[PDB]
Amino acid sequence: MGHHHHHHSHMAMQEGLSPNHLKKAKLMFFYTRYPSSNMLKTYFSDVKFNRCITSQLIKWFSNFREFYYIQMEKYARQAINDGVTSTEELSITRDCELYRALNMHYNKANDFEVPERFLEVAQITLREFFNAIIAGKDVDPSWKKAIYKVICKLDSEVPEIFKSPNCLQELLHE
C-alpha cells in the first residue's frame, strides 16, 4: 500500500472514451480493491491512458469515490449526531428505501440493479463508517484504509462479465 492521492479529476472535463466505458468502468469500480491503480491499469489493458482519457476515467472513479464517500460519511455522521441506534434504518440491506436512495442520487437502478452482494457491502461499509465516527476512528487517517479493506476483502476481483453472463467461459480459450 502506497498513499497515492491526486487532488484532481473533479473539474477534469476530458473526453475520448465512449459512454459505454463510463457504465462498464464504474460497474467494474464497484468494490474491487483499495489498490484501485492496480485494478484500473490492469483491467483496462485496451485503454492506452493518454492524460485526457485518464483524467476522464479517474473523473468517473473520483465521481463515484467522492459521492459514495460523502454519502456513507453523511449517513454515519447523521446516525451518530441523532443517536440512531440502528444502521438498519439507512444504508444496510434495506429493500425499497436504499434502492430509492442510491437510484435517485446516482442513476436509474442500472448499477447491477443492486443484488444482495451490494446490500452486503452497504451493510459492512456503513457498519464500519458508523463504528468509525462513534469510536472516534474517523479523525484517524487509517479509517478509510479500513473501510476500503473490509469491502475489498469480500470481492477483490470482479466475477461478473457485462457483455453476456455466460461469456466469461469464452475468455478461457487457446
CA 135/CA 41 separation, integer angstroms:
36
CA 146/CA 132 separation, integer angstroms:
9
CA 135/CA 13 separation, integer angstroms:
38
Cell of 160: 461478473
Cell of 80: 451518530
Method: NMR
* Number of domains the chain contains: 1
Host domain of residue 162: 1-174
3-state secondary structure of 80: helix
CB 30 within 8 A of CB 77: no
Residues 6+ apart with CB under 8 A from 171: 161
CATH number at residue 92: 1.10.10.500
